Amino acid sequence: KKIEKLEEYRLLLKRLQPEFKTRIIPTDIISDLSECLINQECEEILQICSTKGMMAGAEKLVECLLRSDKENWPKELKLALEKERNKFSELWIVEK
Numbered sequence: 001k002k003i004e005k006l007e008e009y010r011l012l013l014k015r016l017q018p019e020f021k022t023r024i025i026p027t028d029i030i031s032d033l034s035e036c037l038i039n040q041e042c043e044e045i046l047q048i049c050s051t052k053g054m055m056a057g058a059e060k061l062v063e064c065l066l067r068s069d070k071e072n073w074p075k076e077l078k079l080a081l082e083k084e085r086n087k088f089s090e091l092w093i094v095e096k
Contacts, residue, residue, distance in 0.1 A: 010074070020061075
């Protein structure tokens with residue numbers, strides 16, 4: 001369970017997709033995530049939090065997270081909601 005664990009992080013993004021789309025503010029977790037993610041989709045997601053809604057922006061933000069191959073990106077998730085202090089931090093099963 002070395003890389004397999006991070007392999008989990010990816011499938012996990014897909015797994016708590018609904019809990020993400022609902023509780024995630026894509027304008028917030030993006031701050032922690034953008035440290036691993038690229039501005040192009042980061043800024044797009046920020047546009048859709050507006051145009052479509054936070055949920056849709058989050059939905060867009062998930063698919064984008066999956067494209068990143070950092071170590072930190074799925075941790076930016078829990079890290080984000082610890083920083084915002086949101087519920088999602090608890091149910092998300094990432095490092096620490």
